[PDB]
From Swiss-Prot, chain A:
One of its GO terms (cellular component) is cytoplasmic stress granule. GO terms for molecular function: structural constituent of ribosome. Residues 1-29 are annotated as: Disordered. Belongs to the eukaryotic ribosomal protein eS30 family. The modification Phosphoserine is found at S10. It is found in: Cytoplasm. The gene is RPS30A. This is Small ribosomal subunit protein eS30A. Component of the ribosome, a large ribonucleoprotein complex responsible for the synthesis of proteins in the cell. The small ribosomal subunit (SSU) binds messenger RNAs (mRNAs) and translates the encoded message by selecting cognate aminoacyl-transfer RNA (tRNA) molecules. The large subunit (LSU) contains the ribosomal catalytic site termed the peptidyl transferase center (PTC), which catalyzes the formation of peptide bonds, thereby polymerizing the amino acids delivered by tRNAs into a polypeptide chain.
UniProtKB/Swiss-Prot annotation, chain C:
Binds to 80S ribosomes. Actively translating ribosomes show mutually exclusive binding of eIF5a (HYP2 or ANB1) and EFT1/eEF2. Interacts with the 40S ribosomal subunit protein RPL9A; the interaction is direct. Interacts with the 60S ribosomal subunit proteins RPL12A; the interaction is direct. Interacts with RPS23A; the interaction is direct. Interacts with 18S rRNA; the interaction is direct. Interacts with 25S rRNA; the interaction is direct. Interacts with RPL0. Interacts with STM1; promoting ribosome inactivation. Present with 160782 molecules/cell in log phase SD medium. There are 2 genes for eEF2 in yeast. It comes from Saccharomyces cerevisiae (strain ATCC 204508 / S288c) (Baker's yeast). (Microbial infection) Diphthamide can be ADP-ribosylated by diphtheria toxin and by Pseudomonas exotoxin A, thus abolishing its function. This is Elongation factor 2.
UniProtKB/Swiss-Prot annotation, chain D:
There is a cross-link at K20 (Glycyl lysine isopeptide (Lys-Gly) (interchain with G-Cter in ubiquitin)). It is found in: Cytoplasm. The modification Phosphoserine is found at S13, S55. It comes from Saccharomyces cerevisiae (strain ATCC 204508 / S288c) (Baker's yeast). Belongs to the eukaryotic ribosomal protein eS24 family. GO terms for cellular component: cytosol; cytosolic small ribosomal subunit; mitochondrion. There are 2 genes for eS24 in yeast. This is Small ribosomal subunit protein eS24A. Pfam families: Ribosomal_S24e. Residues 104-114, 123-134 have a biased composition (Basic residues). Residues 101-134 are annotated as: Disordered. PROSITE patterns: RIBOSOMAL_S24E. GO terms for molecular function: structural constituent of ribosome.
UniProtKB/Swiss-Prot annotation, chain E:
There is a cross-link at K55 (Glycyl lysine isopeptide (Lys-Gly) (interchain with G-Cter in ubiquitin)). GO terms for molecular function: structural constituent of ribosome. Pfam families: Ribosom_S12_S23 (PF00164). GO terms for biological process: maintenance of translational fidelity; maturation of SSU-rRNA from tricistronic rRNA transcript (SSU-rRNA, 5.8S rRNA, LSU-rRNA); regulation of translational fidelity; translation. It comes from the Eukaryota. Present with 10600 molecules/cell in log phase SD medium. InterPro entries: NA-bd_OB-fold, Ribosomal_uS12, Ribosomal_uS12_euk/arc. Component of the ribosome, a large ribonucleoprotein complex responsible for the synthesis of proteins in the cell. The small ribosomal subunit (SSU) binds messenger RNAs (mRNAs) and translates the encoded message by selecting cognate aminoacyl-transfer RNA (tRNA) molecules. The large subunit (LSU) contains the ribosomal catalytic site termed the peptidyl transferase center (PTC), which catalyzes the formation of peptide bonds, thereby polymerizing the amino acids delivered by tRNAs into a polypeptide chain. This is Small ribosomal subunit protein uS12A. The modification 3,4-dihydroxyproline is found at P63. It is found in: Cytoplasm.
Length: 55, 184, 166, 134, 144
RNA sequence: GGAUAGUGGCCUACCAUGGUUUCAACGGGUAACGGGGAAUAAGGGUUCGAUUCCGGAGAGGGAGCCUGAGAAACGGCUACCACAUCCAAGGAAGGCAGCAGGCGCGCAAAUUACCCAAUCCUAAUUCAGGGAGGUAGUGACAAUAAAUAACGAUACAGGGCCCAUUCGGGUCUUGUAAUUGGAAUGAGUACAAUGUAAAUACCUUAACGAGGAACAAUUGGAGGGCAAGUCUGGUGCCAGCAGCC
């Protein structure tokens, strides 16, 4: 049946964007990278993880 | 009819742009010295590429050749003029040992920090793009000024800026106007 | 606000003489004239001003007959679309639109419109042979009693039973 | 207006057409720029030629302000300037008047209209006028 | 030794031998024979517009049991029957019928893209409106 | 021997049967004007080169011709061919691959604007003319640089080390804050000046010009190569994803 074009696309729920102030970009983005990756020691446990799931 | 205008790119992307061995060290460099983009730093790699190539085919031949000695003597004069090369090494070997930092700390973005007038590389950018620093007698707007080992004896604050006199400030005057209006 | 405003500059103003158009440098504050170079995109007759605000300035027998047009030649869809668009451009009172059929039904106040657009679509902007179709229709359905007998439904899952009345 | 300190550079004189060519550098702290009207006669009292006989063009402003570099030109006498200086600059100074004219197409339209007509057309004019009359 | 001659005045012998050898390239051959010009339905063109005539329900190969909802499109300059593939979900109704779509390649340079056979080209624009922008609800497709 | 301004089968009357060729002749195709060059890379090399400079061919296809030193000229003509305008029905007027602009065509390509002010050219010639040309308008073809943000003070969490007066201060720090504060210029406004044939563009600079609801930066991916989830909800060989597996 060709009528199922984007069938799941229609069945998907409706979720809207969440309010969030814009992240600084430019040299601030490079600055933001440094302050949370290398000098920061929060995630250095076994592999220097940076997007870990809820454990 | 018109004479074509010559142009040439000053940057070159590496053959492998997708690997974790280099992005981390490159992220450190941008954050440390405060560079907005990273097209500039491949430009620096391009800067090292030309001199290394110019040095590579200069040493391929023997000594005492008239063009080789001129190109060698002319070259080493440039690096000692800008300051990326020390004043006690002119053996045409150290011109091949330059690494990425040596052409990057000479940037005006770091000279003001070395003078203690910025207190940070990012605050230095807040003095550069908003014309609050005059590396010479005239104000400039270019972070990559490539000082020539003589600006430090000539560096001074911008004449039409705070800490250089001749004006109190723009928003400082605006705030004074608001205070005067509120007081009255 | 800009609704249908464009700021194209005047190309040239002329004064037509029985289709023998001659160039004109400038025109007075009156009298009818011919103008070219700024028509380009157009939907209906309007006017033209120069100032920011510049405040400025129905016919008997409405279109009645609707006739569908389908081109005989297969590779004519861009040609047909262009032909109908410039036909609407050249016709100040036509009201053609896609409707349910989607073939850009031709309207007109009388069969003389059909007669003129015959030769129009034959040897004009379209310039292609085509055939006419009976006018499109739109018939609905309804009910007028109270479901004297009950309803039922059937499926592979026979356990689904529905009992409704209309 | 704060320490204009006008100063010339590379001044050379050629009696071929009685002019003195030089490039002038002016530094004007605490001032946006200098207009042409007062810029002309400040060379009059330093060269003793005339207020309006001097001529100045260009003066590109360096980035950041406070300094302008360009070409300046003084003239021996006024009468020389009328038949030496091109008339396209006297209109800027106001010495001469810009000749009123239409765009370049009107001259082209006029030129071909006379081109397609042979002779003065004075004899052809009334002959056509009579022909249209009857 | 080692096959090819190594003579000082033998240049023309292995020059012509080179010419026959590079004749075997896939790149050398169809570049001059004009297969992309005389046999391909694009005529050396990266993109081409066409008119959709009807749709297709071609299946896939093993081990996938699915249909890609392919469509049939006719060119203008060349004029031969050509199959096209709908890129994203829900765009079949936007390429239903009588749409001046534009064809584009798959990146395979003249062979099947994936698990859907009989297809070599895809569509990205419809009547001057791109399919991806409409999929992002950025623009609208004119009905007629 | 003719013709040319010239040598020459360029042509003519006669004589001889010859000239080239596997050292690639001749013929066919060329999405073939050539070169100077461009892209790509240690080197070698491959592809492209209509396109700003030089040398060739064309003004729709040939053919013929005057003037003129210089033309087989078409913004000069003559005849045919296929288009094609005006007819007051006899006739006359034309070849945009010149500058703009239009249609058909195509994945594909801008204004029917201003000026000879510049670089020059032409003529009887300093003065006049030149869609040669320059300027402006559209323009994310390609190139260079570079905004969208920083800095202090409070609440946590830290490193060397001082008292060894208990887990008390932590004096110097580096980050997270439903924390707050001043200074700072730019984009956009432009009084004014320079600019420019007149302007429109750049810089300078009276004055207006952030507190994030603000002056809002996107294109793709997150199994492998290819760095980027064993996070949540929905579909369940269906939709689909996927250049490859």
């Amino acid at each position: 049946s060709l009528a199922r074009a984007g069938k799941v696309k229609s069945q998907t729920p409706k979720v809207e964007k969440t309010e969030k102030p814009k992240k600084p970009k430019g040299r601030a983005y490079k600055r933001l990278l440094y302050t949370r990756r290398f000098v920061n020691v929060t995630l250095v446990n076994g592999k220097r993880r940076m997007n870990p799931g809820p454990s | 009819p018109r004479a074509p205008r010559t142009y040439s790119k000053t940057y070159s992307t590496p053959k492998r742009p997708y690997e974790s061995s280099r992005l981390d060290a490159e992220l450190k460099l941008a954050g440390e010295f405060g560079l907005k983009n990273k097209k500039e730093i491949y430009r620096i790699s391009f800067q090292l590429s030309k001199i290394r190539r110019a040095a590579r085919d200069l040493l391929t031949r023997d000594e005492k050749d008239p063009k080789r000695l001129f190109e060698g003597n002319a070259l080493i004069r440039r690096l000692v003029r800008v300051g990326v090369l020390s004043e006690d090494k002119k053996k045409l070997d150290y011109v091949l040992a330059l690494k990425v930092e040596d052409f990057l700390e000479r940037r005006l973005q770091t000279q003001v920090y070395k003078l203690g007038l910025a207190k940070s590389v990012h605050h230095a950018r807040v003095l550069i793009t908003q014309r609050h620093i005059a590396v010479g007698k005239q104000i400039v707007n270019i972070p990559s000024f490539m000082v020539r080992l003589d600006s430090e004896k000539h560096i001074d604050f911008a004449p039409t800026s705070p800490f250089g006199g001749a004006r109190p400030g723009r928003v400082a005057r605006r705030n004074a106007a608001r205070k005067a209006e509120a007081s009255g | 606000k800009k609704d249908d405003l464009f700021i194209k500059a005047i190309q040239r103003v002329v004064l037509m003489m029985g289709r023998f158009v001659e160039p004109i440098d400038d025109c007075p504050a009156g009298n009818i004239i011919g103008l070219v170079g700024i028509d380009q995109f157009l939907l209906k007759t309007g006017t033209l001003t120069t100032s920011e605000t510049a405040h400025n300035m129905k016919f008997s027998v409405s279109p009645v007959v609707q006739v569908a047009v389908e081109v005989k030649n297969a590779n004519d869809l861009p040609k047909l679309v262009e032909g109908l668009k410039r036909l609407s451009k050249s016709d100040p009172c036509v009201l053609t639109y896609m409707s349910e059929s989607g073939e850009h039904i031709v309207a007109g106040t009388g069969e003389l419109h059909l007669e003129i657009c015959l030769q129009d679509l034959e040897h004009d902007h379209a310039g292609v042979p085509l055939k006419i179709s009976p006018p499109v229709v739109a018939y609905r359905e309804t009910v007028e009693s109270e479901s004297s007998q009950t309803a039922l439904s059937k499926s592979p899952n026979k356990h689904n039973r529905i009992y409704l009345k209309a | 207006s704060d320490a204009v300190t006008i100063r010339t550079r590379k001044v050379i004189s050629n009696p071929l057409l009685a002019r003195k060519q030089f490039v002038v550098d002016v530094l004007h702290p605490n001032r946006a720029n200098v207009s042409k009207d007062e810029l002309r006669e400040k060379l009059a009292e330093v060269y003793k030629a005339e207020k309006d006989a001097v001529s100045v063009f260009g003066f590109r402003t360096q980035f950041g302000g406070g300094k302008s570099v360009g070409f300046g030109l003084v003239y021996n006498s006024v009468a020389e300037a009328k038949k030496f200086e091109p008339t396209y600059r006297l209109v800027r100074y106001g010495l001469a008047e810009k000749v009123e004219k239409a765009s370049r197409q009107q001259r082209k339209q006029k030129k071909n209209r006379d081109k397609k007509i042979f002779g003065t057309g004075k004899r052809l004019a009334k002959k056509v006028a009579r022909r249209n009359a009857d | 030794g080692k096959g090819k001659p190594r003579g000082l005045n033998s240049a023309r012998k292995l020059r012509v031998h080179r010419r026959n050898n590079r004749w075997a390239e896939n790149n050398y051959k169809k570049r001059l024979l004009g297969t992309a010009f005389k046999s391909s339905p694009f005529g050396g063109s990266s993109h081409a517009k066409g008119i959709v005539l009807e749709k297709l329900g071609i299946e896939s190969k093993q081990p996938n049991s699915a249909i890609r909802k392919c469509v049939r499109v006719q060119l203008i300059k060349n004029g031969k029957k050509v199959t096209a593939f709908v890129p994203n979900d829900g765009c079949l109704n936007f390429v239903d019928e009588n749409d001046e779509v534009l064809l584009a390649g798959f990146g395979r340079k003249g062979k099947a893209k994936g698990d859907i056979p009989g297809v070599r080209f895809k569509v990205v624009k419809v009547s001057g409106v791109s399919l991806l922008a409409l999929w992002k609800e950025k623009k609208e497709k004119p009905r007629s």
